[PDB]
Amino acid sequence: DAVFGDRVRRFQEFLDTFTSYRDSVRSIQVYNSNNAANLNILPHRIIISLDDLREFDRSFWSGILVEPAYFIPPAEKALTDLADSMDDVPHPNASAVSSRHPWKLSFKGSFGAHALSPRTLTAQHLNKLVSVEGIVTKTSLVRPKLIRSVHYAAKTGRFHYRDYTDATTTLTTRIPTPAIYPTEDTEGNKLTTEYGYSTFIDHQRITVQEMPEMAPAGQLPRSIDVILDDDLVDKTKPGDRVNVVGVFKSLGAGGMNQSNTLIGFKTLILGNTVYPLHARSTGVAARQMLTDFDIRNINKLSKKKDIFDILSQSLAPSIYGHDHIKKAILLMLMGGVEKNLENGSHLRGDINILMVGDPSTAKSQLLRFVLNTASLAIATTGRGSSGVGLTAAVTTDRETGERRLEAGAMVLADRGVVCIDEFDKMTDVDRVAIHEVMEQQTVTIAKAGIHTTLNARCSVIAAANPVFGQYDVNRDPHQNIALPDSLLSRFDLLFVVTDDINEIRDRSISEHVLRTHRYLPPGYLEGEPVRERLNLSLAVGEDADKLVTIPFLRKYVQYAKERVIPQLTQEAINVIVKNYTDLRNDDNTKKSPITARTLETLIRLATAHAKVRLSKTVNKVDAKVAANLLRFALLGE
Amino acid sequence: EIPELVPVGEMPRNLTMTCDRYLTNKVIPGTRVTIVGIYSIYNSKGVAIRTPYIKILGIQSDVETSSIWNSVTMFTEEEEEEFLQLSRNPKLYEILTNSIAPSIFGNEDIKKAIVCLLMGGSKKILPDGMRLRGDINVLLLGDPGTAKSQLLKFVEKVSPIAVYTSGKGSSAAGLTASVQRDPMTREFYLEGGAMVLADGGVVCIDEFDKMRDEDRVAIHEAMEQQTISIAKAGITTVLNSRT
Amino acid sequence: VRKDPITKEWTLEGGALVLADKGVCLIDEFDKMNDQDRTSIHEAMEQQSISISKAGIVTTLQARCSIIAAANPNGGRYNSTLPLAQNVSLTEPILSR
Amino acid sequence: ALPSIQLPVDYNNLFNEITDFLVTFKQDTLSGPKYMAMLQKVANRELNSVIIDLDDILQYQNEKFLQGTQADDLVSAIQQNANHFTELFCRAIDNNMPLPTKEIDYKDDVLDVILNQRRLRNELFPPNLTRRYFLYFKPLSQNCARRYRKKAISSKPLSVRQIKGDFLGQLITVRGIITRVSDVKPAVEVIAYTCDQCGYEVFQEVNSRTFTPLSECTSEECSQNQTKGQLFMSTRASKFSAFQECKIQELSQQVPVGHIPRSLNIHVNGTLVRSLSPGDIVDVTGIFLPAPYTGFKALKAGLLTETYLEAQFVRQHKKDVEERVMELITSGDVYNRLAKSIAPEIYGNLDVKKALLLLLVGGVDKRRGDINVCLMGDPGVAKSQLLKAICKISPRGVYTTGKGSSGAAVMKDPVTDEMILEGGALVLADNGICCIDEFDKMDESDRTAIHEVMEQQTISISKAGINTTLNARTSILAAANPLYGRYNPRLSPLDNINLPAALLSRFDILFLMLDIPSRDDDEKLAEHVTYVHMHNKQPDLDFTPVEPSKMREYIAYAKTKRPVMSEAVNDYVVQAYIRLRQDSKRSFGQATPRTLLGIIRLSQALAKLRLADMVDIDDVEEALRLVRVSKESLYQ
DNA sequence: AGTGTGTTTTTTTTT
DNA sequence: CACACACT
């Protein structure tokens, strides 16, 4: 332990070098204490970048990489003793004091030399801490691990704590032991096992896969499991891009028990710290940041009436025209209020729009633009997905051993904007399933043995081609699209895209494409091949942390969903009802009797229009704008 | 076993091998290799019979094709210099035109279109979320017995970055990528279909008309997006389709 | 291709046209049999090889076989005044190949 | 051999404080001591269990604070680990709370007979065998000033997601609905050993639920002279207890955004066993109890500590004089009141609203009181929001879906390696409420199965061949809507709808809703919605609502006195049926005797609802007015 | 007393 | 890995 003690001393010298860390720990402890007096207790997790401490000690920083299993254990021991000597509030929660709260070490930045990828991970670099960012398909459920056993015979007055770290949490590979709890203890003592004071760490077997696009053609994504034990439990859902900082470790004796003997070795990545980054193009994990500077920004424009049109223009800058369509998709993006009632009847604030368009009307790209604009962005085509699979798969999983719920899109759909393309081609069973589950925004999932009902409230855009190649006015719209009005009425907006062509507009489209094409991508050599590289992003973890820019716009609108919650206002109410007067009984045969749905649709549309204005309540301007756009869409103009 | 050997009426036997750290991952499946390794035997777990396999001491490519081109110029500066010279001489364009489809007797503009398609349209990635679609898919309509399938086969032989197939020969479900149940996992895994293989390659397929239309609809979307988006069976994997 | 429960994987099942390969191929009752099967035969014969990619089996088998189709005229009697295509209940492309 | 860390539990003082509390806790303190009252309950064995109440401990702590004694902070310690405290209570009721010492008539001496032989032929009698009970724990406070009056800090029930490994030691409370309930199974806690030559009766108690046979004898004379003493199973002397384990699903809203709901096992015994049903949403309380594995599971998968999580207390969620309801509904006139107040959001189809009220009670017939409501209605206007309202308010209310692949009586006998019966989707539907969703489009085989079930009030699972008939008369509601969304008034009143005529004719009553742009009622419904906005309660009218519990009592008295129909009613209904048949000859649907039977069922159901049989005539014009309004709605 | 040995229907996918 | 059987 002389080298162990030396590493403890060097880590202490580190803590001395960087006050901010001990300050952060101090802030953590006071956060723990006050919240304890009051919840949401953050764990004893401490985050120190690789680029940190790299300066004062090259040797220690290197040996962390070379032999993490010998560097981090003493480092965390020193972390813990420093914290408990510096928290200075030992008395409260004396029960948990004996159970002990380990202090955990995390990291920031990219190793590069160590941190490359799951596929690039090879045995040549093993027992060394690395980091990889990947998609996780499989997540194992949590199971506590009892490493410190609390057991005691009343007569002894000793309270034996037999602590066992067999395979996972241990780094020294301590010998396996069963923790029998001998009922004789040592001196024939009953040795009652005292529940509580006993450490339990909820274990996770989480396997992470590489990018399909980073994987070369014909190569399946490379998958490797990671372990999380009541320290990093459950930030991430399956199928999310996530960066994990883990050490490459082997277990199972490599399978070389006695003889077959050519079987592979059992290895696995145990990850101390994890940085989830599932945002597209390595963004902010779909979590838009916020600053008071950005807060005060935009707002002054929101007072100006033209801001809504400016936002509409900003959308799909690669597309020409479709300004009303862009306004509609903007209204889509902003989320309406889910009105709740003291019964099973809960009003939906979700926005659902159906659109029919000729092939190559950019609507597919439009759906793609909505995708890359939305946070969740659950999108597919009519042939793209299996309806049951996307809604719910009630098949069992072999590792689980019993019947499992597997909602491909539905559970992914709820609490996020979702998309669907070519719904005419979609399986009719899926169509009738989505029918009335998107109206009620909830699915009973009572199919098969499992009957648990799970909510599915989300905003959906539909882009299905006409039955004929192009919409023919001579044919009825329902002749042009075979999709029944069932839940087709339950689309808050309906859109028809016809690729009719006029010299002025044709020139406009052509010039737009000409500008988009000759334009060399930002920077780069004019004669330079496309790179679309990995960006070699060193920043990992907290290191990663009139026209308007798009991601900035997305951050603003997300901030809006967070903040702006308008309520239906009386003058807006009167405008709405005055419209509805003739809207429900319009003499013109616009087809699709609007009924009671469209009243709620326009309510939501005016609410989101107020959200554009950032007003804490709706305004009649929102109501009349929504009515104007709705009549625009319904007339087909 | 030696696809050229064609043992008549014998199912092709297969043997297991092992590779070392400086031998592993050298070559991909579906590629022929001339191997030099010791004959090897181990017990699988039938009396005194043990698993036959090979421990390899040297790997050589029977197909002889180089590995995944990592831009390392085995053609070196010289061969690419004459390549540019051929590009410098505009007549060589018609040279490539005529050379394609031997014995076709003409159809030169058709061959020019084929050369242009195989040449690969440039995929431009806009600073916007959008991205200009590079590849295109050429449609072959006409009278039968006109070397059309012959020309397709020739073109695929010219460029093996993709694989020649046929509509009926390709599984209707998951043409781009089929979903199959793994023997040791009851979950239906994603098996790479033709356009997974065709991704990154110019692909020729036969009997488009004879193929059932409904799944061919699923092909146009995949080529349009240049990817393959699947959410079937609760699996939301999306794979690129650059073909 | 045949799913093999004993081995637990999909296995190749002997295509009779592969059995035809390397030898003569007899064909009978063909004018009455299934049309999709006829198109499959067209595909197979065009390249003298059968290419199959399904169930994880992407194999392609050479089919070198001299084939002889047996057919009955429409109603069993060919009408010489009638055009052959009208005397034939089958496709034009097959008679071309 | 094992390191030991010292903790300030002060367990013995906890035990003596517990004894002092039990002595000192009164009903007056709750308002003689309550716990010697519990002792005399034990003595005569009036109950089968004695259950510790935390509320009593709360009052004790309050008293000790008044006394100024710290009281060891008993509540916090028992919350942290009560299983050891449970053993302390067992010791106390064995050690310090006295022997019952009360004369009993009978039915307990049989074990006391086993108890009596212990002294002759001579700890020897297990404390659990000594006194028999099931000691549970019932929380002391919730949403009160306790726990510093701050958020959570125990007490507050949490879903499975909020449960953590650190929570294994401490007692917990949980929200949600139990997915399923296991059957009862005897649990052999302590086994009574009987040897052949010696006859000695030694008792060992197994807590691992896995029993290892002793195969030897501890009797001294069997040990000497090497006579083989084998202790055999004397079950009747040994203790048993019914065991039930139940998986509880966390609430959907409790589940995080886009997360798969998690269910955990809950194990019960004694009082609570057999007293639970899966369909209920239960807020139950219990210590957290991790489950030791059978063996070698830990070797392959690490510790992997799982739990069985026995619950000490159970509280099913909400599911007031009975006659007091009658006084209000007489003032309320619940017929009209319920019809409107039941769906204030709908604002329309008031005749349909009246009809649905009668569907709830349904009626009962000696020879069978089935309304057979079919709501073909209008698509995209109602019958989904209109639907499922009765599901929550009425128990056994099921919002079933005819199609949509939402689930139909899919029995799963092969649910486990062993063939154990498992109910399907339709068997869940029962007499309370059966709401069909997406009825118009649905599986034809399911259509035939449901038609046979409803016409027979029986369910046939087959498979093993057994006819497990659990269904009885049940109220049925149809979500069918006209095909294409636009019914044809001119032709095909029955054929414009996907449902077959035989299926249509099977229902006793059928109604049609139709949306028309003729009037400005759009604006009135708009006023209702613009109530629902900035008045997030209801469209304010004279609806006079009936609370579902009050509605439950209204249903309870809706089946009253079994009103025998008057023969004047009999003549009136036969004349009405004759007129209906004659008009049918004149249209699309000929009058059927079963239709007249359904009319009679309507009349008697309304009669026993609030009124009575008597001449019963007036109720018959009420029901037949409903019928003719339905017929006109079909005709329009 | 040697020493050995055992426990973790559905749903697409064909067609 | 490690604990009940069947002799060792």
Ligand SMILES: Nc1ncnc2c1ncn2[C@@H]1O[C@H](COP(=O)(O)OP(=O)(O)OP(O)(O)=S)[C@@H](O)[C@H]1O
């Ligand atoms: N212009 C041509 N020059 C040379 N050979 C030709 C020409 N047209 C047809 N052929 C020959 O005719 C054969 C018939 O074509 P195939 O390779 O069978 O495929 P294909 O032309 O697509 O016919 P289908 O449409 O599939 S029946 C070719 O293989 C050539 O050998």
Ligand SMILES: Nc1ncnc2c1ncn2[C@@H]1O[C@H](COP(=O)(O)OP(=O)(O)OP(O)(O)=S)[C@@H](O)[C@H]1O
């Ligand atoms: N009369 C009404 N009063 C209040 N809300 C109404 C009314 N009619 C329709 N709605 C609204 O529209 C929905 C009610 O229609 P539902 O009963 O859910 O559907 P449906 O009419 O059965 O539709 P299908 O599937 O086309 S038969 C809810 O979201 C209500 O808010």
Ligand SMILES: Nc1ncnc2c1ncn2[C@@H]1O[C@H](COP(=O)(O)OP(=O)(O)O)[C@@H](O)[C@H]1O
């Ligand atoms: N108005 C437009 N401006 C720019 N590009 C357009 C426009 N309309 C169509 N396109 C182009 O059409 C192509 C195909 O569009 P796509 O999204 O597949 O069409 P659809 O609307 O039928 O789904 C894309 O390259 C897209 O940029």
Ligand SMILES: [Mg+2]
């Ligand atoms: Mg499209």
Ligand SMILES: [Mg+2]
């Ligand atoms: Mg061809």
Ligand SMILES: [Mg+2]
């Ligand atoms: Mg409904």
Ligand SMILES: [Zn+2]
């Ligand atoms: Zn004995």
